């Protein structure tokens, strides 16, 4: 207890609607960006996970991709067909299968990056006011706090991984390494 029941219902509905809105917008923009290259959302997500972690287990891919293991194997295979990634020999347990990007896939990823225009995506524009007032893009700490308690600190290490990987691996003259 030490909270009202009402309060709980209000908060629940509030976040469920907010989170549905946000996921749906990001989903739509993202799908726009990547549909030229015939990639599902999951597939691009998987490709990035491989870039950032220097290859991964399916169980890694499903953890950081917030998908089920099944989907991670299925879409991983679909990508193998497209020559984007490679598979390890052991298929004992789908979970332990190890994935690693082919070179063609890495070029796909870099290309998609040069195709990137922020000003086309909704959520970016929705956040620009806040960037202007604060001088920096919104941190949305409360959200991160929540997802940490939900998903775990090792989960949460992907944010640090990707920050460092973007900063170090690439540089910009018009947008790419």
């Amino acid at each position: 207890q030490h909270y009202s029941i009402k309060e709980a219902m209000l908060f629940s509905q509030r976040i469920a609607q907010l989170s549905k809105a946000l996921w749906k917008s990001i989903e739509k923009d993202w799908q726009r960006w990547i549909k030229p290259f015939d990639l599902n959302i999951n597939e691009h997500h998987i490709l990035w996970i491989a870039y950032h972690f220097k290859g991964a287990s399916i169980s890694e891919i499903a953890k950081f991709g917030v998908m089920h293991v099944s989907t991670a194997f299925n879409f991983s295979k679909k990508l193998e067909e497209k020559g984007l990634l490679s598979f390890s020999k052991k298929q004992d347990d789908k979970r332990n299968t190890y994935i690693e990007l082919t070179e063609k896939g890495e070029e796909v990823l870099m290309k998609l990056m040069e195709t990137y225009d922020p000003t086309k995506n909704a959520v970016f524009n929705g956040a620009l006011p806040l960037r202007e007032l604060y001088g920096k893009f919104p941190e949305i700490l409360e959200m991160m706090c929540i997802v940490r308690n939900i998903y775990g600190d090792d989960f949460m290490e992907i944010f640090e991984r990707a920050f460092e990987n973007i900063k170090e691996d690439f540089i910009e003259q018009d947008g790419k390494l």
Copy 2:
């Protein structure tokens, strides 16, 4: 411009991962709560929209339900089959079809409410630390600001609608009106 390209990529990835995590958790908890009653997530969402707005157009239902019109008609029909809601006579345009809850549906909704246990749902527990430190549940303003610029102030009026409807229509001794 007046921001870095890098910055944009960091922010994009950050929010896309955060928002996927949040939507997936709420999705899983919600599905747990409502699966006894053989209801899709969309279907429950539609039923609430009808309760709050005293019936609605399909186009209303899709706006506030963040779904496509097609889905809103399809799942609305599935609910009509279940005797939960009623349909208007005009089917000229799916969009203008007017939906209104049957009594059986309203009982379903109230029942689901008495079935509600917050302590079972992840995101609730993830937010309790913040509730303790602040003395109130997290407001997540930055998120709301964003969704407002994205979706519109009339969209955003559902939060006020539902706050007032919960407060006024119901009272709690163990949880329900």
Copy 3:
């Protein structure tokens, strides 16, 4: 431990400068507003404390006025001279002396209120951007959290007291009850 020493120094300096800036600005604006009526900052603060709490002990006045007891007695006396407030008979302990506003003082307070122009005060203008982005004036929760741990929940009840007193006791056509 479980923090860096450096971190501690950074945070300390940061807040000490921020808090000096804020106090000095509010001090200057406030002094501008009240200098017509020949009132020190403390004296006006004391008068409000009496209005809100329906009279008070000196020890109350010093708690909520964040001043020393000595100052609270001295400036309280200066106000008695001005016919603004009245004193209880017991002077056994300065702390237990009970203060209550004269009518003249209450008129002074209401007058000062009609003299109030927000647009003249700095800190108000500094906060208007945030009010525009958020649709509401900044909550500055982190600050309140801090002051709560510092000063105590009974201290913190003055915010609720004054919110309710402003809302209920007064109404606005051009600014006053």
Copy 4:
């Protein structure tokens, strides 16, 4: 307009009380830390400003010290008497007088640093809960936003100056360079 008058009064009182509380606590802790060395708050503030800016004008000192010019000259002189700082030859305009720390003063500053214990100061402890929940000390952005609109971006550059100076100039084994 486009806000209520009431709202303005609420916000004003709220921040004025919060800011008085915070300044008074920091004032008391700070005075505790520095009273061994017979230093006013202003005097220590002035000494730090000189360290960070490699000497300064009085007008600089008053800007960043949020004091009047008069006080900045007076307390600067008192420090010259103590052999802490040195003066430029020109006294044409007090404002343009240039101050620079003597070596004795720098040792005083470093000493005070080794005397530093965070766990003694109130505001530090008031913020530790937030540090624990967030994993980092509170940013209090809203406050900084406000002070920026109030005081100016060049004013605000002292935060960056001191961050970099602390990080680079010193290192810690038990607390000092």
